[PDB]
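Q: What would this complex look like in 3D?
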Amino acid sequence: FNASLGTYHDLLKIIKDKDFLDNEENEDILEDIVLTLTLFEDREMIEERLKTYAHLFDDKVMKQL
DNA sequence: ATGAGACGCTGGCGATTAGCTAATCGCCAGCGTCTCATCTTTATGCGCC
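A: Here is my prediction, written as C-alpha cells for the whole assembly.
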C-alpha cells in the first residue's frame, strides 16, 4: 500500500494514549499540535506554543512531544 | 601759363620637425566553505467517464 497512518503510530508511541488520537472530537487540537510541530523547530518556541496543552499530557510527555 | 603714368627665385630639393594607428598574439580572467529551513519537479509503482 502507498498510503499509511504513520502519525497515529508516532503519537501512540509518544503520548502512549490511543484514545486521544482515535477520538473524533480531538481533531482540532490534533491539527493544531501538528501545525505547531511543523511550523517550528526550536524547543523553546514549541514549548511556548504548547503551554496551553500541557494539562492533557505529563510534563515528561510534553518534553517528548 | 606742368610735371604723373610703367614695382622680386621659386620650385625643387633636403632636411628638419612633428606625430600616429594598426595588426598579432598572448593572458587571463575572485573563490572557499558550512548551517538552516523552504518549496517544487522527475524515474518507477494504482483508477474509465
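A: To summarize the key features: The longest helix of chain A spans residues 27-39. Helices of chain A lie at 6-14, 18-22, 27-39, 43-49, 59-64.
Q: Very helpful, thank you.
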